[PDB]
Amino acid sequence: SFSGYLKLTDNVYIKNADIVEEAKKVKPTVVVNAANVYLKHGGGVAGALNKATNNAMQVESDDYIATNGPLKVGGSCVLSGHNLAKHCLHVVGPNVNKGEDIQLLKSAYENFNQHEVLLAPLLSAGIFGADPIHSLRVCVDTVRTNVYLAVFDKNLYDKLVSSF
Numbered sequence: 001s002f003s004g005y006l007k008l009t010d011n012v013y014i015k016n017a018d019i020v021e022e023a024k025k026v027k028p029t030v031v032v033n034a035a036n037v038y039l040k041h042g043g044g045v046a047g048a049l050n051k052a053t054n055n056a057m058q059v060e061s062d063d064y065i066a067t068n069g070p071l072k073v074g075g076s077c078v079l080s081g082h083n084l085a086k087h088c089l090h091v092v093g094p095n096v097n098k099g100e101d102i103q104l105l106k107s108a109y110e111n112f113n114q115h116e117v118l119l120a121p122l123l124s125a126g127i128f129g130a131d132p133i134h135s136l137r138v139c140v141d142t143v144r145t146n147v148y149l150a151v152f153d154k155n156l157y158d159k160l161v162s163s164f
């Protein structure tokens with residue numbers, strides 16, 4: 001049910017799209033969230049996904065942290081996808097604006113390999129401060145399962161395709 005994507009490799013696809021609108025249309029098995037270790041979904045992709053769930057994602061996430069403590073940078077957890085997907089895979093890429101090790105970006109993408117197909121954003125891009133061209137290259141070189149990347153910004157999408 002994914003449509004309109006540009007094929008980059010055997011398993012990686014990309015589209016200029018709002019991941020919330022894409023998730024509402026497709027209702028994928030897995031949507032990836034660009035999470036932080038606390039699962040505090042304030043801004044960026046996480047703020048947008050949480051708002052689309054009417055804050056249900058944040059209420060579930062606060063219970064998960066109260067029980068388990070914070071995630072690791074490069075780690076993940078599977079929670080409900082609420083009205084957006086069957087599941088949400090919350091993945092923590094390194095935040096350059098907080099000074100985190102960019103080498104953890106490959107470990108972050110390795111979480112995607114536990115799922116046959118995913119709808120996802122580029123990790124560590126946007127307000128996380130990493131170069132999105134670098135993030136797409138690590139994604140291509142690490143993920144082996146089928147990943148459908150939604151890039152919100154039209155100008156960034158064009159730059160990512162042209163420089164691939």
Ligand SMILES: Cn1ncc2c(C(=O)N[C@@H](CC(=O)O)c3ccc(Br)cc3)ccnc21
Nearest residue numbers: 019044045048121122125126150151152153
């Ligand atoms: C309504 N809302 N607010 C943010 C956001 C995001 C979001 O932060 N995406 C990131 C990642 C991406 O989409 O490639 C991003 C956005 C813009 C630039 Br420029 C660079 C990275 C995605 C969906 N809905 C969103």
